[PDB]
Enzyme design. Structure first.
Site, short mmCIF file in Angstrom:
data_model
loop_
_atom_site.label_atom_id
_atom_site.label_comp_id
_atom_site.label_asym_id
_atom_site.label_seq_id
_atom_site.Cartn_x
_atom_site.Cartn_y
_atom_site.Cartn_z
N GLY A 17 42.21 38.57 50.75
CA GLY A 17 41.32 37.97 49.74
C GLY A 17 41.62 37.90 48.49
CG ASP A 158 39.19 46.57 48.84
OD1 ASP A 158 38.19 47.11 49.06
OD2 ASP A 158 39.32 45.63 49.26
N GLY A 201 34.37 47.55 47.71
CA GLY A 201 34.76 48.91 48.39
C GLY A 201 34.16 48.97 49.64
CG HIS A 290 32.94 37.27 47.67
ND1 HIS A 290 32.23 38.06 48.62
CD2 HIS A 290 33.86 36.71 48.34
CE1 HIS A 290 32.92 37.96 49.71
NE2 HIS A 290 33.87 37.16 49.70
CD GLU A 621 52.67 43.97 11.83
OE1 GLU A 621 52.26 43.57 10.47
OE2 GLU A 621 51.91 44.65 12.39
CG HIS A 653 46.32 44.19 11.52
ND1 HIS A 653 46.49 43.64 10.20
CD2 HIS A 653 47.37 44.62 11.95
CE1 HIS A 653 47.82 43.80 10.12
NE2 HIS A 653 48.50 44.40 11.08
CD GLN A 655 36.65 45.46 12.46
OE1 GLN A 655 36.13 44.78 11.40
NE2 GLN A 655 36.68 46.55 12.64
NE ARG A 727 53.89 55.03 10.32
CZ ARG A 727 52.89 54.48 10.97
NH1 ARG A 727 53.08 53.53 11.84
NH2 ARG A 727 51.67 54.97 11.07
N1 LIG Z 1 45.34 44.29 61.89
C1 LIG Z 1 46.03 43.27 61.70
N2 LIG Z 1 47.22 42.79 62.48
C2 LIG Z 1 47.72 41.65 62.37
N3 LIG Z 1 47.58 40.76 61.38
C3 LIG Z 1 46.40 41.09 60.50
C4 LIG Z 1 45.66 42.17 60.72
N4 LIG Z 1 44.73 42.27 59.75
C5 LIG Z 1 44.77 41.13 59.22
N5 LIG Z 1 45.83 40.45 59.58
C6 LIG Z 1 46.29 38.89 59.24
O1 LIG Z 1 45.94 38.91 57.81
C7 LIG Z 1 44.54 37.79 57.81
C8 LIG Z 1 43.52 38.47 56.92
O2 LIG Z 1 43.22 39.74 57.39
P1 LIG Z 1 42.39 40.49 56.03
O3 LIG Z 1 41.07 39.62 55.75
O4 LIG Z 1 42.12 41.96 56.69
O5 LIG Z 1 43.40 40.56 54.80
P2 LIG Z 1 43.73 41.85 54.08
O6 LIG Z 1 45.43 42.06 53.67
O7 LIG Z 1 43.19 43.04 55.27
O8 LIG Z 1 42.91 42.18 52.82
P3 LIG Z 1 41.51 43.03 53.19
O9 LIG Z 1 41.31 44.31 52.27
O10 LIG Z 1 40.20 41.87 52.18
O11 LIG Z 1 41.28 42.97 54.41
C9 LIG Z 1 44.24 37.90 59.44
O12 LIG Z 1 43.47 36.82 59.92
C10 LIG Z 1 45.64 38.05 59.99
O13 LIG Z 1 46.16 36.71 59.89
#
Ligand SMILES: Nc1ncnc2c1ncn2[C@@H]1O[C@H](COP(=O)(O)OP(=O)(O)OP(=O)(O)O)[C@@H](O)[C@H]1O
Ligand SMILES: Nc1ncnc2c1ncn2[C@@H]1O[C@H](COP(=O)(O)OP(=O)(O)OP(=O)(O)O)[C@@H](O)[C@H]1O
Ligand SMILES: Nc1ncnc2c1ncn2[C@@H]1O[C@H](COP(=O)(O)OP(=O)(O)O)[C@@H](O)[C@H]1O
EC number: 2.7.1.11
Length: 748
Positions: A17, A158, A201, A290, A621, A653, A655, A727
């Site tokens: 993401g 995360d 998280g 998001h 500077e 500088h 503020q 300095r």
């Molecule tokens: N456990 C897994 N094994 C193999 N491929 C994976 C796996 N998890 C994710 N992927 C690959 O990455 C894509 C997106 O996964 P994901 O949304 O979990 O991204 P991420 O790296 O785990 O970040 P996030 O922390 O948001 O999950 C999956 O559709 C697949 O293409």
């Protein structure tokens, strides 16, 4: 080297993401990838395009990654391809790789994406033999065998992944969350409002904790350590205790993955119901979501992106059929290539460990700092503090030097943590003009009430030194009974510190211990990789730098020459230079000769004459007595008459008393404690006969960041580690970045 990646091509990809910084990663990955004689290939829409192929795998140029640093989210594109999670798809992707001829793969993603590439590097052996039953001529497999290099570059708001100190975007994510509470916080003046922000998280309480630590959250809820047993009472007892204790708002932060002892999840709404049914305050839940991923990437994430990017490509070109899967990352403030597998196999460990009511193992596998923030968060968060006896050691805290974003945050934990030790804490107005003129007060728990976020210097900081007035201050450290000193300041705190030791020779009073907490915009204090208020300054430069890369120009093609502050320290300029991708950042620690300066221009021009339309030229500077701003300016102007226009800006500088970013507030909060804990010791250990006598060097330190850890170092031990003329320290870690900063501008 330039010949390294020759006869080599790589495809970068952005799964997971949107994490603010991914774009800088890509850029760096491309820019450095070309540079190394290699060929870099994009791959739109995460793992998808890799599976698909064809028009999803276009080739990247240099002009392609231009103007990305500043843009959030992924531009190469990120999808959610689940076809890859199955071999009925990984095989087609591989096909696409071998069909396009590619032996290196950079994956900028998260715990999952990363774990996917992982399993991909593994299930790659058989992938050939199988895609041989009909794939392409077997002439290729005998020409790309046990050679499938993949580097995982961790991008995720995360900060969950384990093995890396920071992931991409979490600092920006931190900014978002902060700007909101920052706003929520500075309005609630009517009723006893009680916000209930729910933050990101899934399984990690990070953002949730860190955000509480910067806002002074009234309570918090995080995964790795659920509120075992009757808490609602606690939380209400608290919220009311604090209500009558005199207060307007309340900010109960809630991690999403917020569960309880057993596991039946705590709900942000539920929490909200509780307080209203039990106490009945106008509570109001909010659920950021998001947007945390939105906004623009902070100076840190842009920088962190670029560093990781370069690390990846190196790691890619330095691979061997005998080298394992790699995951580059930061630790102790330096790049590292870590065993992909090991990282995944472990970053997973924490989940199970959490699935079983085994939270102690949870909080542990997470541990270190995390656990610390937790600990310090709660302490400072208390409503208390303890009853003050008499045999209590009394400490004094003060600010010295030019002001910084974080001073008030440090003064606040220094006093809170002090007060929680049962010690007395005096507060000094105006640094050393402080113990001297006598402006000293006793600070109670509320004195520091809600400062953690206020910028500037609440107490007042001057840069004057002690010596000239030892008589008066010693006279005063006796009168008020000061028995330790905590100095938050910049160079003249370090310097005034040394200035104190000598005093220990002619005066017995100065024979108390002292710690110096580095708080300087300039990051010029010896003995620490960072100082409080740099990030804040830095983020502002980088910001206005971006805002200036606009200007109502009567026409395109234009070059900007900007002078940063920081006296002789090239930290900001160098950093900002890299965060805002300038063509050049002239600093002192790296001397330039017109023979160069020339070449630096008989270059931007060769670019403004094509690809580039706006140019950035950063000047420290004080990088050089003769080659002033105006010199560099005029030079750059003339040399580019016709080809481009140019203006010169001197930020100066502006503020620096604005407001501390979340990182300086954490940094100044974490140390302010670390020091006040360390100092309570040195004061016991120096109590001898109804008097204290610290006359050793251990009792006189500067606490600073040095690789993976915070470390107390005695001022005298640092003398020979510091250039006092300018300095600044000798040996700045960051001068290690200059080169990358240069290759990204296309040099050498
Ligand atoms: N456990 C897994 N094994 C193999 N491929 C994976 C796996 N998890 C994710 N992927 C690959 O990455 C894509 C997106 O996964 P994901 O949304 O979990 O991204 P991420 O790296 O785990 O970040 P996030 O922390 O948001 O999950 C999956 O559709 C697949 O293409
Ligand atoms: N701000 C907080 N956020 C989350 N949990 C907290 C917080 N403050 C205390 N706790 C939890 O309360 C329990 C410990 O209470 P402690 O006895 O440590 O605080 P206290 O003295 O009871 O409360 P106060 O300090 O508000 O009077 C632990 O579960 C601790 O995690
Ligand atoms: N904005 C930043 N600037 C420089 N380094 C940072 C920044 N944010 C995080 N880091 C790095 O992350 C690691 C520290 O993380 P941590 O112990 O969790 O402190 P915090 O709790 O303040 O993140 C170190 O490598 C530190 O240098």
């Amino acid at each position: 080297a330039r010949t390294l990646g020759v006869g080599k091509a790589i495809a970068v990809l952005t799964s997971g993401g949107d994490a603010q910084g991914m774009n800088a990663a890509v850029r760096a990955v491309v820019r450095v990838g070309i540079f190394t004689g290699a060929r870099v290939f994009f791959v739109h829409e995460g793992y998808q395009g890799l599976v698909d192929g064809g028009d999803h795998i276009r080739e990247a140029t240099w002009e392609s990654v231009s103007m990305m640093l500043q843009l959030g989210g992924t531009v190469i594109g990120s999808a959610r391809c689940k076809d890859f999670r199955e071999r009925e798809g990984r095989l087609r992707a591989a096909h696409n790789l071998v069909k396009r001829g590619i032996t290196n793969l950079c994956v900028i993603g998260g715990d999952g994406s990363l774990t996917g590439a992982d399993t991909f590097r593994s299930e790659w052996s058989d992938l050939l033999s199988d895609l041989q039953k009909a794939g392409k001529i077997t002439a290729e497999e005998a020409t790309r065998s046990s050679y499938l290099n993949i580097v995982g570059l961790v991008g995720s708001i995360d900060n969950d992944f384990c093995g890396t100190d920071m992931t991409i975007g979490t600092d920006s994510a931190l900014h978002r969350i902060t700007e909101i509470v920052d706003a929520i916080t500075t309005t609630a003046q009517s009723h006893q409002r009680t916000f209930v922000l729910e933050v990101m998280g899934r399984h990690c309480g990070y953002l949730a904790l860190v955000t509480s630590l910067s806002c002074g959250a009234d309570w918090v809820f995080i995964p790795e350590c659920p509120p075992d047993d009757n808490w609602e009472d606690h939380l209400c007892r608290r919220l009311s205790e604090t209500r009558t204790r005199g207060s307007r708002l309340n900010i109960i932060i809630v991690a999403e993955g917020a569960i309880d002892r057993n596991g039946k999840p705590i709900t942000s709404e539920g929490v909200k119901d509780l307080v209203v049914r039990r106490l009945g305050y106008d509570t109001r839940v909010t659920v950021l979501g998001h947007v945390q991923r939105g906004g623009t990437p902070s100076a840190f994430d842009r920088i962190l992106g670029s560093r990781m990017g370069v690390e990846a490509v190196m790691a890619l070109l330095e691979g061997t059929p005998d080298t394992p899967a790699c995951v580059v990352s930061l630790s102790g403030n330096q790049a590292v290539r870590l065993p992909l597998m090991e990282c995944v196999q472990v970053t997973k460990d924490v989940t199970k460990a959490m699935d079983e009511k085994r939270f102690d193992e949870a909080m542990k596998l997470r541990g270190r700092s995390f656990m610390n923030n937790w600990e310090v968060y709660k302490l400072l968060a208390h409503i208390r503090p303890p009853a003050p006896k008499s045999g209590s050691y009394t400490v004094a805290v003060m600010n010295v030097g030019a002001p910084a974003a974080g001073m008030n945050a440090a003064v606040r934990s220094t006093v809170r943590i002090g007060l929680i030790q049962g010690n007395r804490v005096l507060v000094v107005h105006d640094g050393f003009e402080g113990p001297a003129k006598g402006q000293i007060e006793e600070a109670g728990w509320s004195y520091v009430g809600g400062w953690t976020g206020q910028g500037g210097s609440k107490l007042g900081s001057k840069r004057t030194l002690p010596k000239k007035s030892f008589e008066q201050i010693s006279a005063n450290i006796t009168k008020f009974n000061i028995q330790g000193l905590v100095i938050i300041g910049g160079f003249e705190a370090y310097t005034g510190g040394l200035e104190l030791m000598e005093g220990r020779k002619q005066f017995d009073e100065l024979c108390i211990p002292f710690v110096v907490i580095p708080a300087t915009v300039s990051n010029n204090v010896p003995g620490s990789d960072f100082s409080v208020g740099a990030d804040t300054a830095l983020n502002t430069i980088c910001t206005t730098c971006d805002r200036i890369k606009q200007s109502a120009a009567g026409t395109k093609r234009r070059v900007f020459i900007i002078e940063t502050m920081g006296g002789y320290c090239g930290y900001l300029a160098t950093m900002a230079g890299l965060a805002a991708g300038a063509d050049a950042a002239y600093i002192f620690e790296e001397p330039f000769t017109i023979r160069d300066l020339q070449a630096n221009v008989e270059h931007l021009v060769q670019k403004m004459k094509t690809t580039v339309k706006r140019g950035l030229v950063l000047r420290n500077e004080k990088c050089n007595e003769n080659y002033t701003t105006d010199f560099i300016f005029n030079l750059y102007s003339e040399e580019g008459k016709g080809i481009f226009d140019s203006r010169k800006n001197v930020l100066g500088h502006m503020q620096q008393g604005g407001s501390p970013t979340p990182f300086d507030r954490n940094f100044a909060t974490k140390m302010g404690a670390k020091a006040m804990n360390w100092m309570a010791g040195k004061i016991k250990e120096s109590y001898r006969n109804g008097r204290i006598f610290a006359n050793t060097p251990d009792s006189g330190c500067v606490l600073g960041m040095r690789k993976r850890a915070l470390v107390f170092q005695p001022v005298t031990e640092l003398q020979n580690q510091t250039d006092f003329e300018h300095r600044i320290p000798k040996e700045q870690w960051w001068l290690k970045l200059r080169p990358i900063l240069k290759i990204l501008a296309k040099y050498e």
